[PDB]
Amino acid sequence: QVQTIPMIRGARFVALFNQKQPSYFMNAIVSLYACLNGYLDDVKVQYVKFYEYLLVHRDLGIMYGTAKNKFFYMYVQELNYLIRFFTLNSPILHGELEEMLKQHTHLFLQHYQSKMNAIKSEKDVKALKNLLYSCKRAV
Amino acid sequence: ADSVGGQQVQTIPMIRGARFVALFNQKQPSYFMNAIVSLYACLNGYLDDVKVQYVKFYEYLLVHRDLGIMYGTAKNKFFYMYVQELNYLIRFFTLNSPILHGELEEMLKQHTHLFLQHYQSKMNAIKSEKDVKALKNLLYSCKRAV
Amino acid sequence: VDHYNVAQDVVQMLTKYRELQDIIAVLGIDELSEEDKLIVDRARKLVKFLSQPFQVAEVFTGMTGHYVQLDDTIDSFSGLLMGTYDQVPEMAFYMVGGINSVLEKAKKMAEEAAELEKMRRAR
Amino acid sequence: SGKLRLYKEKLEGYNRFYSIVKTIKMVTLAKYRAAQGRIRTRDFSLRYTELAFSKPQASRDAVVAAKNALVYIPITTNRGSCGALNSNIVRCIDSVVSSKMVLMPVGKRGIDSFSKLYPDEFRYGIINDMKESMHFGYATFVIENAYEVSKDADRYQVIFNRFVSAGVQRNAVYNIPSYEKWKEDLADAASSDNQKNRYLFANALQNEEEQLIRDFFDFHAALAVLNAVGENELSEQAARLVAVEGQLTNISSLQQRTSSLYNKTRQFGITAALIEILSAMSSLEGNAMKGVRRNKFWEG
Numbered sequence A: 001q002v003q004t005i006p007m008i009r010g011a012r013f014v015a016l017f018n019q020k021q022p023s024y025f026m027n028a029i030v031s032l033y034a035c036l037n038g039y040l041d042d043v044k045v046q047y048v049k050f051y052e053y054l055l056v057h058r059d060l061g062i063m064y065g066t067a068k069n070k071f072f073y074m075y076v077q078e079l080n081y082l083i084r085f086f087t088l089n090s091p092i093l094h095g096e097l098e099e100m101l102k103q104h105t106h107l108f109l110q111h112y113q114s115k116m117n118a119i120k121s122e123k124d125v126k127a128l129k130n131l132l133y134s135c136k137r138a139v
Numbered sequence B: 001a002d003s004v005g006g007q008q009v010q011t012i013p014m015i016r017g018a019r020f021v022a023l024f025n026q027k028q029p030s031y032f033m034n035a036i037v038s039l040y041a042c043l044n045g046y047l048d049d050v051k052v053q054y055v056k057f058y059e060y061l062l063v064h065r066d067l068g069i070m071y072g073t074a075k076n077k078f079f080y081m082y083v084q085e086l087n088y089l090i091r092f093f094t095l096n097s098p099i100l101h102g103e104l105e106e107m108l109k110q111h112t113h114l115f116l117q118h119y120q121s122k123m124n125a126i127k128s129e130k131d132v133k134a135l136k137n138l139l140y141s142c143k144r145a146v
Numbered sequence C: 001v002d003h004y005n006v007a008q009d010v011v012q013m014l015t016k017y018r019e020l021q022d023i024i025a026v027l028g029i030d031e032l033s034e035e036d037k038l039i040v041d042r043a044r045k046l047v048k049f050l051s052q053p054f055q056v057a058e059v060f061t062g063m064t065g066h067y068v069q070l071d072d073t074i075d076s077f078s079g080l081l082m083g084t085y086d087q088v089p090e091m092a093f094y095m096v097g098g099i100n101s102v103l104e105k106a107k108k109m110a111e112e113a114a115e116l117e118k119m120r121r122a123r
Numbered sequence D: 001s002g003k004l005r006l007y008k009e010k011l012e013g014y015n016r017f018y019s020i021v022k023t024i025k026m027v028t029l030a031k032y033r034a035a036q037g038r039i040r041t042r043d044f045s046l047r048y049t050e051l052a053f054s055k056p057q058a059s060r061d062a063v064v065a066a067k068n069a070l071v072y073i074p075i076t077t078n079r080g081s082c083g084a085l086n087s088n089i090v091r092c093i094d095s096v097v098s099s100k101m102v103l104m105p106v107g108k109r110g111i112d113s114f115s116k117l118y119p120d121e122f123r124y125g126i127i128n129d130m131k132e133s134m135h136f137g138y139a140t141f142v143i144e145n146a147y148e149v150s151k152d153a154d155r156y157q158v159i160f161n162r163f164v165s166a167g168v169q170r171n172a173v174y175n176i177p178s179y180e181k182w183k184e185d186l187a188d189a190a191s192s193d194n195q196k197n198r199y200l201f202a203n204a205l206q207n208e209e210e211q212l213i214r215d216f217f218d219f220h221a222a223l224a225v226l227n228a229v230g231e232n233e234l235s236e237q238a239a240r241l242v243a244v245e246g247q248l249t250n251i252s253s254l255q256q257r258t259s260s261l262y263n264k265t266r267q268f269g270i271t272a273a274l275i276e277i278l279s280a281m282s283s284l285e286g287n288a289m290k291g292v293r294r295n296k297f298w299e300g
């Protein structure tokens, strides 16, 4: 099974399209941009939904104290119209967007995916499945 | 279903299914006693050694003839196929009953042994231009005789 | 939520059991992995556990009927999927209601087996 | 209606086709399971055969300087439906066509395919019934015919299929240099540090008498042939199971496409008829009319 770059991103895109409730414009576009730029290449397919949830409803950088962005924090819903106005590729919002994405990816791979890859206990497996079900149904 | 090529293997279920599918070929209706007896014989394997082509002839001898009486070997007291009034006894008492089960198996075993010994042995030894035709005509007649 | 998760897990296991049936037919049972061979045992227990004796047939079948509660069914299947009841014999799930019935049937089967073995040793 | 039944007959044929192809899958399944033992028991007979013939040489110098017949013995299956094995082998042979190329293919597909494509290069083939197990005698028959095809042959090549796994069937090559070139190389390995791994082997064979060496050469050549045919059979059955599954699914898709057209046709046929009857009922009613009503209208 040869997995080139287009194949990896396509699979991640397909997983992201799984939704139950409508997504706010800022959250959806940000997640799509992250997947398009390859930030989810290291993230396993089954964990994409959990990765997306942490990006929208959580902030790893603030949690682990490795964040320095001035404005581009995803909890600021007011940024949606600013993104709608200029772009996600504008120099005004491009640098901070990359920085927070890189920090979020680095923290997620370091803390969460590493632990999820080291689960063998049947009870833990059941807990992980329940977590994934909840994340899939909620962003 | 797997017999379309592959040289179908003759297991006991197949060895008995073919006989069943060959006994169902008939022209006139069969009296209950004759039909039930023949099915029972094929069900317990008494026709496993009988070729599929000779099944009708085997049934005809069982019904309209009595090999045991012909060769003076029959030992049953009442259970004979020429007693057409046994039908209602069989209806009241199933063939799998001690009253009739013992004699039924004895008659079937004796009839099967005599048929293989005398008739089928000669059939497999037919080598001629007229005997083969006579055998073929005989089988066809027995096909629509019972 | 627990009901939904259990039901989906059961469906997934049954679907996987079908594909493994084909695979074992292709090559054989031993050819499957440890993981897959554990899944072919749980699935068979599930198929047997979904049967049930109905009280309406308490007369013509002779077996006492069962009325399994909703919560009991969810818990029973949830435990089975995890692997808690991996020691119970497969036939203990056949025509039974709930999990307690499974345990009772298994004990009776074990007692019957012990008695038969004990009788055999005598002779 | 004939049109509706035309689809029904068409779908009737596909049903029988599925059953027959299903039967093929089972037949090949048994032979696949029987031949699956080779997977376990392979990879140990040909150990010193490697030293005898394993020479990772360039693909150009070998064929460019051919002054004598280069004999090829591609392995091909008797029956089709195997897959792309035969096609790839032909591509592998077409890529090495030369003036001195002689072909002695194996299998009916090999004889028929290579007879027409390369007439002068094809001399004759060998056909074996898949009734007994692939044994030494069959390999000896391949070699003896190969020598008589071209005794003064620079090399004899065998192109077969290696069954890496249930879904991986590669194309493999056994090159066998004739006695003169082999003994010359065997002489250099013994006398020099070059061919180090063959140094002890070359001296060991050199000590013994010639007839033994000739027997040794023929014996190991037969083993290489035996391995190729054995592997080619296992790859054949594995490939057929994969191919047959593809045919089953293709024949299932057609059954689902012709059934819809059959169920769509009956619905249209019923509607068209009833409309047509009910348009000839409206016409009769419309053309007809009630005449002057002769009754005591005043009496009311």
Ligand SMILES: O=c1ccn([C@@H]2O[C@H](COP(=O)(O)OP(=O)(O)OP(=O)(O)O)[C@@H](O)[C@H]2O)c(=O)[nH]1
Binding pocket: D207, D208, D209
């Ligand atoms: O006429 C001959 C001469 C030599 N040989 C054979 O050549 C080989 C040379 O082998 P060696 O000279 O290395 O040893 P060897 O005679 O002790 O060996 P063995 O007999 O124990 O095997 C030996 O195996 C010898 O028998 C013949 O067979 N015929």
